[PDB]
Structures are given as structure tokens and as C-alpha cells.
């Protein structure tokens, strides 16, 4: 992957101070727009999509598995799980703790469908059964947001989180019914108002996911974005920055999303 007309994103990533990572695709022309899109990123949140897809697709195999109640404890309940939190006395759905972790980026949720899942190595060897081979998850939440510079473990690239999300989405990696849950769950987030959508046509639908470290100014989205008459868009926006304490920006990653749909 390559962009000849790379300096618009390349003054963008001076100013923010860090490295940003773009990778989006026009599925009805074929059409890509690339920067830094081999090179990995922590993944944070944005994992947590992705675990809802495996779900799904093991629901293919197990009836009544998205039905099934968890009565989880209050020790599961680590920071930032509003949903789990607010539901702890009833417990939750397998349906409705992968909702929670896409719409609401719920960790406790995450963590608890990951143990479902055997683990980051289980999701992790989903997205391997997909042709996915960039992907890696090796830590369960919070550990995963270290985003330590160079630091290969729980990270992806956006070439490849654009690629496994047309898969999952657009193409034939779920079955038709899990599918349009997964592009429901997505539509429905409440994270991503100034990150992708920020940057797309308020005609036109988007379904997103995000992710926010917390350290070394790293946050980033993924979505698919449906134009007007048209094929969908599919793609990955990614931060990371070199220190600690660097700010993660929402509004580079508009910044960058806009450039990436400009390009296209
Ligand atoms: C430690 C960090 C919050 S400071 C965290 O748990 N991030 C996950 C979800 C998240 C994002 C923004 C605020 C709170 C939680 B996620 O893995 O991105």
C-alpha cells in the first residue's frame, strides 16, 4: 500500500506531534487511500468489535448461545463498565454484554464474553480463521492499554482492521443474520460522535467502533460509512504518540477520517 499524495496527512501527524495510521477503501471502485496502514497500533477498545463478531459467529454454531444469561459478580466489574455496572443485579445477556462492549466500550462486558471466548488467544484465533493475520490480542482489560512505543502485543494494523471489518460486515465471514446484528451494534454506538463521524455527511448512516488508551497518545476508530446511492466505505483511523503523558486527539482523528473520505 502507497499514496503519492501523502503530505496532507504527513503535516497533519507533524502538528498533532505523533504517528497516525490510515487505511480506507471504496468497495464499489476498489479505491484505497494508505498512510502508515502497515504499521501497528494498540488496538484498546477497538478490540472489542471485533469480539463482538466472534461471538456472533460462534452463536452460528451454538443455538441460544446470544440468550444465554451471565450472573456475574461485582469483582468483574472494572473501571468503565457503565452498562455492567448498572445491570449488575440482574446480570446480563451474551447479546447484551456484546452490545454494551461495542456501543458503550463496557470492559467488564468485554472481559466476561472474552472468557467465553477462551481468552485473547481465542479472539485472537477468530480473526486468524478469517485471514486475518496481523491481528493480536494478548492482554484482557485494562492490562491491554499499555501502549508502550514498539510494543507488538494487543495491537493491529489499519490495513488489516479495514480488511476483517469488510469481511465481517460486507462479506461472507458471518452468516446473514449475525452480520446485520454486527452492522446494528455498530450504528448504534454512543462513543464515536467526534472521531469518523465527525468527519462524514450527517445523511450519510455510519456504524463505528473506538478505542482510547488513556497513555502515549493513543485513541482510534474504525467504521463503515454507507454514501449516499453507493457502495459502503470502509476504514481505520489510528493514534499513537511517543510519550507518556502525550493527549490523545478526537479531533485528528476527524481530521484524518475527512482526509481519508476527501481522497476517496
Ligand atoms: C484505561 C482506559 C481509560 S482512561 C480504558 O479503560 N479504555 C477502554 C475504554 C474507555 C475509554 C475512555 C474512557 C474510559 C474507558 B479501552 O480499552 O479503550
Redesign the pocket.
Known sequence: STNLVAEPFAKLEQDFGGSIGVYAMDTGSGATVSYRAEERFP??????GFLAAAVLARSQQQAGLLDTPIRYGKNAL???SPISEKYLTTGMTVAELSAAAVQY?D?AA?NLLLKELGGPAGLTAFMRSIGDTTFRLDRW??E??SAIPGDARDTSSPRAVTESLQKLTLGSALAAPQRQQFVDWLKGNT?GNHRIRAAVPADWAVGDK??????YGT?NDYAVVWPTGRAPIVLAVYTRAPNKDDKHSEAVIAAAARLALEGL
Open positions: 488496538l484498546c477498545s477497538s478490540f472489542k472494572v473501571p468503565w466500550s470492559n468485554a482489560e485494562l491491554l492499554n462513543t473506538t478505542g482510547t488508551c488513556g497513555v485513541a
